[PDB]
Amino acid sequence: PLPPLPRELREALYGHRWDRVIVDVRRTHTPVRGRGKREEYTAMVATGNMRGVFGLGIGVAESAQLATARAHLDSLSRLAAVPLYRGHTLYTHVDHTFHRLSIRMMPRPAGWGLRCPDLLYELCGLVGLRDVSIRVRGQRGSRFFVAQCFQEALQKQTTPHDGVEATGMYIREVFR
RNA sequence: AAAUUAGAGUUUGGUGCUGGCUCAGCUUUCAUGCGCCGAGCGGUGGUUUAUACACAUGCGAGCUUAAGGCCACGAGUGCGUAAUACGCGAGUU
C-alpha cells in the first residue's frame, strides 16, 4: 500500500520545525468468516511545530511499521492551529469532555513548568505549551480519547485580537 | 512585589464503560533483616508510644535566727469527663 503526500505540504516540511509522537499502538481482534482471527494495529500519531499548530492522525493497518507510518503521514496531512499566549500558555481556563473523560486545564504563569501527566507532557511540548497544569478525570484508560479531547480542548478557547478593530476599546496592561 | 491540581498496570476474543486492588509521592518508628560503627560542632525528638501495671535501692524542699519564722512554683500522665471542660466574644458585683 501507498500513503499520500501533497504538493503544498512540501513548503511546510522545509518550513517550520516539526516533532512527532506516537500516542499508543493497539492490537484489536476480529474473528472473520473463512480463515480465522484477523488483527489490525491501530496507531495514533501527534505532530506539531512548537509554535501553535497541532495535528493528530489515526491510522489502521496490518503491521506496526506501516500503521505508524500511515498515522504519521495522516497527522502531517491534518493540521489545526491553536493560539497561545506568546507560545507558552493558553488564554482561558479550559474544561472539556470527549467520550466521557473530564479533562481540566488551567493556565499557569511562565516558568511554572509543566505539571502534567505522561503522554500529555510530550503533547504539550509538541504543540508548544510550556506552562500548564492539567488533570484528567473519568476513565483515563485510553490514550486516543485524551489526544482527541486535548485537540478539541485547545480549539475551544477565545482570542483577544479579534476585538480592537470593532469594539472601540483598547486591550493592554497585563500587570498583575 | 500574591509562587496556585502527574499517572500507570490490572477484567475481556477484542473496544468502551463500572468501581475496586496495587505500584511510583511525602512523612513516620531504639520496626525487622544485611553493612559500616573514624572524630567534632549542633539541632532536635522520644508521651517506657501501651500498664492510671508491681516496684529493689539511691536521690528529688529545704532555707533561717532547742524554739519559732518561710516551703499551693516547678515535673509527670490522660483514669475519668461529650461538658462547672476547652476555645472564641462581650460585660464584670
Solving technique: cryo-EM
Please state the φ and ψ torsions of residue A46, each to the nearest 5 degrees. -105, 150
Give me the CA A27–C1' B12 separation in Å, rounded: 13
Give me the CA A107–C1' B41 separation in Å, rounded: 48
**Which set of grid coordinates corresponds to residue A27?**
492490537
**Alpha helices, DSSP H only, in A18-139?**
64-77, 118-127
Q: d(Cα A73, Cα A107) in Å, to the nearest integer?
A: 31
Q: d(Cα A127, Cα A130) in Å, to the nearest integer?
A: 9
CA angle, A15 as apex, A57 and A124 as ends, to 5°?
45
- Model resolution, angstroms: 4.2
Helix or strand (DSSP H, E) at A102: strand A101-107
Contact call for residues A103 and A75 (beta carbons, < 8 A): no
Task: Tell if A34 CB is < 7 Å from nucleic strand B.
Answer: no
Give me the CA A167–C1' B14 separation in Å, rounded: 55
